[PDB]
């Protein structure tokens, strides 16, 4: 049963890392969106 | 009666507002006043120098 909890917390941490990468990408994407209009 | 309740309610509210205003304003009023006096002293020393 503890393996499921380990998997869940591991998933949470991987998700946080992905969000941080998205934030690093985000200024360029925001400016390209502003560039479109 | 209802009028007797209104006096109690309004008086308690006035008490709270009054003591709140005193605590929040009198130290500030004295701070501002000391600063006014200090500005006045500086103005006097400035006019006497010039």
């Amino acid at each position: 049963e503890k393996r499921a909890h380990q998997e869940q917390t591991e998933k949470t941490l991987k998700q946080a890392a992905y969000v941080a990468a998205f934030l690093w990408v985000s200024p360029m994407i925001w400016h390209l969106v502003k560039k479109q209009w | 009666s209802f009028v007797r309740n209104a006096f109690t309610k309004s008086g308690n509210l006035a008490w709270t507002l009054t003591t709140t205003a005193l605590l929040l304003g009198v130290p500030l009023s004295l701070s501002i006043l000391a600063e006014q006096q200090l500005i006045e002293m500086e103005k006097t020393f400035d006019l006497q120098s010039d």
Partner: protein, 35 residues
């Protein structure tokens, strides 16, 4: 009559919006001494 958790949520949100409008509004400026 609710007296539920959304009550305190809504009450603190209302105090927030009221305070932001009090702060952002001209009334807060009046509370600033000119000196």
């Amino acid at each position: 009559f609710k007296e539920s958790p959304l009550y305190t949520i809504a009450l603190n949100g209302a105090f927030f919006v009221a305070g932001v409008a009090f702060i952002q509004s001209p009334l807060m400026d009046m509370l600033a001494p000119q000196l």
